[PDB]
Amino acid sequence: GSAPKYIEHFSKFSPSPLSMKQFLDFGSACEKTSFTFLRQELPVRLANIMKEINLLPDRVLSTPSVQLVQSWYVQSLLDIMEFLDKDPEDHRTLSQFTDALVTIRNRHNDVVPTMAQGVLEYKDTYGDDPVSNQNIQYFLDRFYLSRISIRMLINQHTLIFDKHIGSIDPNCNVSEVVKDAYDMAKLLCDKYYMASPDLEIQEINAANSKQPIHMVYVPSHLYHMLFELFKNAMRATVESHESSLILPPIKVMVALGEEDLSIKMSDRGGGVPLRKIERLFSYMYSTAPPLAGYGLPISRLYAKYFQGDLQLFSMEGFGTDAVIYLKALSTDSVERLPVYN
Ligand SMILES: CC(C)c1ccc(COc2ccc(CC(=O)NCCN)cc2Cl)cc1
Ligand SMILES: NC(=O)c1ccc(O)cc1O
Ligand SMILES: [Cl-]
Structure with missing residues (x-):
């Protein structure tokens, strides 16, 4: 052939x-x-x-x-x-x-x-x-x-x-997708553990205070990333507090700036040492023979795909911030493609 x-x-x-x-x-x-x-x-x-x-x-x-x-x-x-x-x-x-x-x-x-x-x-x-x-x-x-x-x-x-234009929602309500992904993660977390942290969302519309934050995006991609991050933030919060009685909520901020739409998920899961952060994105180190390839590295590719990113910053002994960075503007939302050479 x-x-x-x-x-x-x-x-x-x-x-x-x-x-x-x-x-x-x-x-x-x-x-x-x-x-x-x-x-x-x-x-x-x-x-x-x-x-x-x-x-x-x-x-x-x-x-x-x-x-x-x-x-x-x-x-x-x-x-x-x-x-x-x-x-x-x-x-x-x-x-x-x-x-x-x-x-x-x-x-x-x-x-x-x-x-x-x-x-x-x-x-x-x-x-x-x-x-x-x-x-x-x-x-x-x-x-x-x-x-x-x-x-x-x-x-x-x-x-x-x-x-909707296929997988694209030209009026994606970011907070609604945050709640959806949280509600699903909570479902699994309640099943596998006797508890689940609550959710707090805060929005910061810099240019238009109190106007709900919308964007052109592929909501299934955004759900995939938020679901993966909720699972990790819930496992950590629950396991780090199983001798404690209080269970800190997961706090999500959605920020809309001139060019960035930023989603931070903050937990008090007791964090991870800086040394172990790179491993969480490593296909090799996260391969072995979450909740009950892999979620984090592939969630970061979804963010990168339209010129965004996904970063983790932890504070060992306290907790972990995960940030999804997206382009606010449909004009800056261009496929990022690996080219052969
Ligand atoms: C995902 C799977 C299929 C997979 C498994 C393993 C690999 C890794 O492949 C290797 C391993 C070592 C080196 C260094 C070297 O010595 N280079 C010599 C190359 N001739 C190069 C490559 Cl491309 C990729 C993909
Ligand atoms: N284990 C952790 O602290 C942790 C890891 C990844 C993540 O997205 C969130 C977390 O709390
Ligand atoms: Cl097409």
Whole structure:
């Protein structure tokens, strides 16, 4: 077959990062334009990461987990090729493309735990030295960020072409998503422990005091990050106080500035020493044989994906602040994509 040839062809192109603006307009031009865009852009994005996978050393590349994921990417690229010559005006072309995208999305559902098995095997077969850790971190941050970007494209297409524009809410109420993610975390926390901390939210709308804070965002991404952070803040608060009786609440501040929309989650879970902070973001050090890959490093990629970030600052003996940084403005919300070279 031609998969290596295709990988070589399409890996010559740079992925084309889109803004919220471009994402919103695609959900007004129409389906024909999304098809002609995606049938070029997905092969570019697939090929770019596949080429990087092929640069891994043979002792990583030859393992079953990487071979299995490499085979998903090959099939998914070939499924998209079928459509390069097809005629956009034929509505049978268009509905078949949507079908093809749903299959591809489903096919890659188990990438995270599959890659996690590759990390476990590497730890036991070659060891867990700091240079191994940086290469795993380098590779998986790029791989998972690439994968987030591909799921975004597919989701926008399949959801729009069967108020919200697919996975985008142009009027996302940040505090509502905070409450949702808290309510779910509380549910799990009450089940596994005899207690759960309460929630306090404070908003700070710098330019428009007391006006509720809204933004253009992908609320499922924001929920994913807030849920992960609530789980950690709840486990820590509960376990650090099981001999205590009082249970400090989790305090969330939502700040809207000129360019940043910032969400701080503060707990009194007794904190972590600075030395152990880097480990919490490490795919390697957080892989082993939360509440009852991994949550923190992947939550940080979701934040990075539209030019944001997620930082942890702890105070050993007191507690931990987690901050999600997002761009306030849809104009500054552009895909961050790993480019091959
Ligand atoms: C996520 C899984 C699949 C996984 C597991 C492990 C790895 C790590 O791969 C390594 C390990 C060590 C080195 C240093 C070195 O000596 N370089 C020589 C390279 N020839 C480079 C790389 Cl790319 C990545 C991804
Ligand atoms: N264990 C911790 O103190 C802790 C870790 C991560 C996080 O997001 C919050 C926390 O309290
Ligand atoms: Cl789209």
